[PDB]
Amino acid sequence: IQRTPKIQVYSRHPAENGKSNFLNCYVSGFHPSDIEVDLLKNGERIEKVEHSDLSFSKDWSFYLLYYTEFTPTEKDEYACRVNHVTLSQPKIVKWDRDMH
Amino acid sequence: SHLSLLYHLTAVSSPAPGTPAFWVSGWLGPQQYLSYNSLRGEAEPCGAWVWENQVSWYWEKETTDLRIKEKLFLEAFKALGGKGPYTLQGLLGCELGPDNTSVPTAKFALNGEEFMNFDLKQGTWGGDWPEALAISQRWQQQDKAANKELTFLLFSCPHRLREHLERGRGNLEWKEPPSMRLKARPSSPGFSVLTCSAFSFYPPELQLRFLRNGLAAGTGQGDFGPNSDGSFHASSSLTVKSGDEHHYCCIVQHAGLAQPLRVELES
Amino acid sequence: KSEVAHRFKDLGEENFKALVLIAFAQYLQQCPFEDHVKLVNEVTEFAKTCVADESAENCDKSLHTLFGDKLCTVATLRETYGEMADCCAKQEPERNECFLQHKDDNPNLPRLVRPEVDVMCTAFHDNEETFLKKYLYEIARRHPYFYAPELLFFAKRYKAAFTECCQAADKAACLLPKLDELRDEGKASSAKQRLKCASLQKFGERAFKAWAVARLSQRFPKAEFAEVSKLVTDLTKVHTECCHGDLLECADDRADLAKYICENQDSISSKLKECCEKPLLEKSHCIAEVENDEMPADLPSLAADFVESKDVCKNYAEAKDVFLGMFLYEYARRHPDYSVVLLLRLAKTYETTLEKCCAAADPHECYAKVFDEFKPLVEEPQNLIKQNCELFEQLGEYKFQNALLVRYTKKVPQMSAPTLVEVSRNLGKVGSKCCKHPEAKRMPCAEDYLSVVLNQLCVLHEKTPVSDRVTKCCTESLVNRRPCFSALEVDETYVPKEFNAGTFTFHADICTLSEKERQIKKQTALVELVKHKPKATKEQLKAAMDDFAAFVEKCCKADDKETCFAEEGKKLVAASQAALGL
Ligand SMILES: O=C(CCCS(=O)(=O)NC(=O)CCCCCCCCCCCCCCCc1nn[nH]n1)NCCOCCOCC(=O)N[C@@H](CCC(=O)N[C@H](CCC(=O)NCCOCCOCC(=O)N[C@@H](CCCCNC(=O)CSCCO)C(=O)O)C(=O)O)C(=O)O
């Protein structure tokens, strides 16, 4: 079977302008495991990102946590961009500043 | 109820270049303590478990057992032919129970669908698809494989689980309460969305609810995910009429709080 | 026609029952004490019927069939005994061989913490036999190759210590020194026996006999070679039997060997007279520890017989092991202060030289300088221990262990930190055990003790191997193990661990530990640093460890400790990368 990723974007600590923090992109519920994730700062890919091990849930679907150190400011927009066999084109989710 | 040790195993038949054909994550309840992949070939501790007060050869025993499973999983693809690509997953582990008893788990899935298990009283792999039979016989015909699987689930897993409970108790009994924020934003015309957010908490069990005039206003719509250190994030959103935002508050329940915490709108 | 009746008569019921209890505790280390006493008592009741009538049912069966059969009544529980359960599906002799493969050289069994003297003395008084059986059970299950007849002697001295001290005025001042001496003798005794068993089982009778020839020649230099060889053959059967789990035969034959020796002192040694007047168990123990006899006053040089004489290749070819044996015997009797493992290296070197040269064009020329080859074999060990004892006295115990920890992580980065920490602790004890000896005895002490630490490493690595270089050093040749490990350079095939945001993930629980407990954390960190850069210098490593210690100090004083740890861990990661030069 195939399963399309769910994508959430959120910070590790409550965001405050000018304070170091981490930004998460959590992609879950997908199958097969091949997937492409980029974190973006004002549309540009962030190089200094890391991720957790690809693991999976009881329903056998995969999940994966990407994250990057960042210092949010009022002006900057951050986003996560995901491609997967189940998607015709990359899906971009914007950081909602913890207000969906 | 009872916390368990489970191994999440995956093998893929056509890995992207420079990515592992086989990899394992090991979990003590909701915490990942173990990582293994076929490119590196050793099992290694994760996170705070690097510092666990552990016995000599514990980790080389984890490495030894997963190398055997690595080969078995890759052999399974040979027993299939078909055409592929294939994904083979296994969930193997145990959970402690009553009268100092262990309950094992041994399930497998192919390209995302469960198709096979290991019967621990009989020591056999079984399933109904042609693929379960093909893989199960190939494994059955492997000298000592069923014996090693029996020992892995009936002996090693519960012994590992009991050791980590004693020696990793600081990690298992970690408590970190959420930092809370309540925010509103406009939505459809005449409506606003209220979002109650919980940052950096452990353990993962958490409830968010909205109140108005001290009485239940609703749970809202929620989501949930991990941070890199194995703490968690959660949020819940409620749609309300514009102008009513300040009438609502958010209440959170978590093991890390002396009592439910009420959270008020921020401007 | 009945071995169980035969062994029961030779040994007597008390020693029979004690050895049978030891046997079960060593095979089934996880089994509760009361189950073992029931089984030992049943076999012994059974044993009594075979003496009464050497023909009653099952009295004709082999010892391994009888004992194995009982074990497989309970050892069928895979939950408790692991892969051992697979042994009960097979027949003798493989069933027995399978059980020996699964003897656990590292049982994870609770430390045995000593109670107060008064509580133990009451337990002793309340039920003396049960108290002493418990002593055998606890020692045997933690040391499944403990030399069983010697364990009997430990138990007798342990019983004697309680008998005397629990009636003394200062009980603890009488008792605790005595229990500590036995505790310490037992691990040493246990470690040596583990090495004897590894040589017989992994290398074979010839390798063991070479060791015994050398050692007996040191202690009994006035005996003729024919008498030593006889003693070596006797002793080889004893240890073969103990190491094969044949404990009743081992003890029986060891007693016979002890009587032969005492009935032939004039052919063996002048130090045996009083020993040979002691009781049975004490007699055997005294003989094994007796001081070396004096060597003959004026011995010729070895040149005549083994280098210059022209028959060497003639004598060698018709009985190579007797000739190499005679060389070992002559070299060993002249050098009671050489370590035996070094002597065996000399003899193996000599063997290697004669194999090539006795094939050669002019044999006498080819091997005329063979004794020169011994000088480097003596020089390397002596220099090793001079520097290490120099290092040990400058640095002290804890920092010396840390130096070896770094050294061995570089050598075997595939081992886990707990394994490396424990190896370095054991190696470091060779420091304080031997470096305090007189100059001349420092090197023999060390080669012997290091050979027992490495064997303990090797027998565990064999069960769960992770370094090909370790497998090579452990299986290549018993006598060259220590030089092989010394020569290991930093392992450049090891792919370093990568740094990431979670490399130093701590919780607030580390702030509540004792500094002793903190020490293993620092050591574990030191392993992890090496694994992130195997070629790191001492200076890079000290800098990163100093950062580590400040990180712990900063966050454990902090108002929000868990939060401090989340915020500073990744800062420590970046600081650590820089310290190591990335
Ligand atoms: O050395 C040996 C043994 C070798 C055997 S072996 O198998 O080959 N063992 C080994 O090789 C072990 C070596 C260890 C291995 C070495 C390997 C080393 C490798 C090193 C290099 C490699 C490094 C190793 C590293 C390992 C490794 N592996 N991987 N990495 N590392 N043997 C020595 C010599 O051989 C034997 C010599 O034989 C000589 C002999 O024959 N001896 C005889 C002598 C007789 C004797 O004394 N016997 C006694 C018996 C006791 C006794 O008291 N007997 C007397 C009682 O008899 C009665 C006599 O008295 C009665 C009496 O009163 N009167 C007699 C008179 C009769 C008249 C007869 N007349 C005559 O004879 C003359 S005629 C005169 C007329 O003019 C009456 O009865 O009436 C005894 O000693 O027991 C002997 O028997 O011993």
| DSSP one-letter string for A54-65 | -EE-TTS-EEEE
Angle C42-C47-C48 from CA coordinates, rounded to 5°: 100
Fold of domain C200-289: Serum Albumin; Chain A, Domain 1 (1.10.246)
Q: Give domain A1-100's CATH architecture.
A: Sandwich (2.60)
Q: Which fold has domain C3-102?
A: Serum Albumin; Chain A, Domain 1 (1.10.246)
- Radius of gyration (C-alpha) of chain C in whole angstroms: 27
Q: Where are the alpha helices (DSSP H) in chain B?
A: 58-78, 130-140, 145-151, 157-167, 169-172
Question: What's the topology of domain C117-199?
Answer: Serum Albumin; Chain A, Domain 1 (1.10.246)
- Could you say which of A12, A58, A100 has the minimum Cβ distance to residue B237? A100
Domain count, chain B: 2
Strands (E), chain A: 6-11, 21-30, 36-41, 44-45, 49-51, 55-56, 62-70, 78-83, 91-94
- B240 backbone φψ class: left, alpha, beta (φ>0; ψ -120 to 50): beta
CA of C335 to the centre of ligand 1 (A): 26
Cβ neighbors of C439 (< 8 A, separation 6 or more) are none
Pocket test for ligand 1, best of C203, C228, C229, C354 (most atoms within 8 A of CB): C229
Q: Evaluate whether A3 touches A28 at the Cβ level (below 8 Å).
A: no
In 10 A of CB C578, how many CB atoms?
Answer: 12
Residue B161 makes CB contacts below 8 A (sequence gap 6+) with: B3, B4, B5, B28, B94, B95, B96, B102
DSSP secondary structure string for all residues of C477-496: -GGGHHHHHHH----TTSPP
Of B53, B60, B151, which is closest to C78 when you measure between CB atoms? B151
Please give the Cα distance from C66 to C43 (Å, whole number).
Answer: 9
- The token pair at A67 is 């994250």
Phi, psi of B73 (to 5 degrees): -60, -40
Same domain assignment for residues B72 and B14 = yes
Q: Identify the CA nearest to B136 among candidates B148, B155, B123.
A: B123
* CATH 1.10.246.10 domain residues, chain C: 3-102, 117-199, 200-289, 302-378, 379-487
State the Cα torsion C304-C307-C311-C316 to the nearest 10°: 120
Look up residue C301 and give its DSSP letter. P
Whether C242 and C148 have beta carbons less than 8 Å apart is answered as yes
CB pairs under 8 A between A and C: 6
Distance of residue A97 Cα from the nearest chain C Cα, in angstroms: 21
CA C69/CA C32 separation, integer angstroms: 18
| CA–centroid distance for C314 within its chain | 39
**Cβ pair C79:B174 closer than 8 A:** no
Q: Which residue has the tokens 């514009």?
A: B242
DSSP C270: S
CA distance B178 to B253: 10
Residue nearest to atom 30 of ligand 1 (CA): C477
The rounded distance, in Å, linking the Cα atoms of C426 and C458 is: 14
Rounded-to-integer distance, Cα C430 and Cα C392, Å: 10
Q: Give the CATH number for residue B221.
A: 2.60.40.10
Task: Count the Cβ atoms, other than its own, within 10 Å of residue C277.
Answer: 11
How would you classify residue C449: left for phi > 0, otherwise alpha for psi between -120 and 50, otherwise beta? alpha
Chain A neighbors of B199, CB-CB under 8 A:
11-14
Instruction: Give the determination technique.
Output: X-ray
Strand partners, B73: none
Distance (Å) from CA C230 to ligand 1 centroid: 9
Q: Are A71 and A16 in contact (CB under 8 A)?
A: no
Q: Which of B124, B156, B173 is the last residue of a domain?
A: B173
Residues B94 and B103: beta-carbon distance below 8 Å: yes
C104 annotated to a ligand binding site: no
Q: Which is it for strands B124-126 and A62-70: parallel, antiparallel or unpaired?
A: unpaired
Distance B40 CA to ligand 1 centre (A): 61
Interface chains of chain A (3 or more CB pairs under 8 Å): B, C
Which of C419, C463, C502 minimises the CB distance to B229? C502
| Burial tier of C375 (Cβ tally within 10 Å: 0-12, 13-18, 19+) | exposed
Same domain, B79 and B130: yes
Angle between helices C225-243 and C320-333 (to 10 degrees): 100
Report the nearest atom of ligand 1 relative to the CA of C325.
16
Q: Collect all residues of chain A within an 8 Å Cβ-Cβ radius of residue C500.
A: 50
One domain, residues B62 and B169: yes
C308: number of Cβ within 10 Å: 12
Protein residues with CB under 6 Å of any ligand 1 atom: C 203, 206-207, 209-210, 213, 225-226, 229, 232, 321-322, 324-325, 328, 344, 347-348, 351, 477-479
Print burial letters for A57-75: b (CB count within 10 Å at least 16), e (below 16).
eeebbbbbbbbbbbebeee
For ligand 1, atom 39, the nearest C-alpha belongs to C226
Residue pointed to by tokens 């005492």: C262
CA atoms within 13 A on the CB side of C382: 11
Q: Are C490 and C411 a contacting pair, CB within 8 Å? A: yes
Do B72 and B116 belong to one domain? yes
- Beta-sheet strands, E only, within C121-226: none
Instruction: Tell which residue, B262, B249, B257, has the closest CA to residue B195.
Output: B249
For the record, the structure tokens of A88 come out as: 């015709």
CATH number at residue B76: 3.30.500.10
> CA-to-CA distance for C578 and C519, rounded, in angstroms?
24
- Cα(C331)–Cα(C295) distance, rounded to whole angstroms? 12
C477-507 burial, b if ≥16 CB within 10 A, otherwise e?
ebbebbbbbeebeebeebeebebebbbbbbb
State how far residue A64 is from chain C, nearest Cα, in angstroms: 16
- Please indicate, yes or no, whether residues B194 and B161 belong to a single structural domain of this protein: no
Rounded to an integer, what distance in angstroms lies between the CA atom of residue B223 and that of residue A29?
Answer: 13
**Among residues B126, B153, B173, which one ends one of the domains?**
B173
Distance CA C308, CA C288 (A): 36
C18 CB-near residues (< 8 Å, 6+ apart): C136, C152, C155
By most ligand atoms within 8 Å of CB, the mutation choice from C196, C230, C322, C482 for ligand 1 is C322
- The strands making up B221-226's β-sheet, listed across from edge to edge, are B179-186, B191-201, B232-241, B221-226
Instruction: Give whole-number Cα distances, C569 to C45, C445, C554, C581, in Å.
Output: 65, 45, 11, 18
Which of the four CATH numbers 1.10.246.10, 3.40.30.10, 1.20.140.10, 1.20.1250.20 does domain C302-378 have? 1.10.246.10
In DSSP terms, which residues pair with A92 in a beta bridge? Answer: A81
Same domain, B25 and B156: yes
Task: For residue C464, give the nearest of B53, B64, B155 by CB distance.
Answer: B64
**Which residue's CA is the nearest one to ligand 1's atom 36?**
C226
DSSP for C23-51, please give it.
HHHHH-TTS-HHHHHHHHHHHHHHHHHHH
Residue C406 amino acid letter: V
State which residue of chain B sits closest to C566, comparing Cα positions: B229
Could A67 and C500 be called an inter-chain contact, meaning their C-beta atoms sit closer than 8 Å?
Answer: no
Q: Do B50 and B84 have their domain in common?
A: yes
Domain-terminating residue out of B153, B173, B193: B173
Which domain covers residue B181, as residue numbers? 174-264
| Cβ(B69)–Cβ(B63) below 8 Å | no
Q: Which CATH code is given to the segment(s) C379-487?
A: 1.10.246.10
CA–CA gap between residue B23 and residue A67 (Å, rounded): 21
DSSP H or E segment with residue C222: none
Chain A (15-74) residues lying within 8 Å, Cβ to Cβ, of chain B: 22, 24, 26, 28, 31-34, 50, 52-56, 58, 60-61, 65, 67
Q: Are residues B128 and B230 in the same domain?
A: no
Cβ of A50 under 8 Å from any chain C Cβ?
A: yes
CA distances from C106 to B187, C109, C141, C143, C457 (A): 65, 8, 10, 9, 11
**Measured distance CA(C292)–CA(B229) in Å, rounded:** 63
- Comparing CB atoms, the residue among A2, A26, A60 nearest residue B89 is A60
In whole angstroms, give the CA distance from residue C466 to residue C486. Answer: 18
In angstroms, rounded to a whole number, what is the distance separating the alpha carbons of residues B218 and B204? 21
Assess contact for B185 and B192: CB atoms under 8 A: yes
Q: CB count, 10 Å around CB of B82?
A: 12
User: Using CA atoms, how far apart are residues C360 and C366, in angstroms rounded to an integer?
Assistant: 7
CA distance A89 to chain C (A): 31
Residues of A in contact with B228 (CB under 8 A): 12, 22, 24, 50, 52, 65, 67
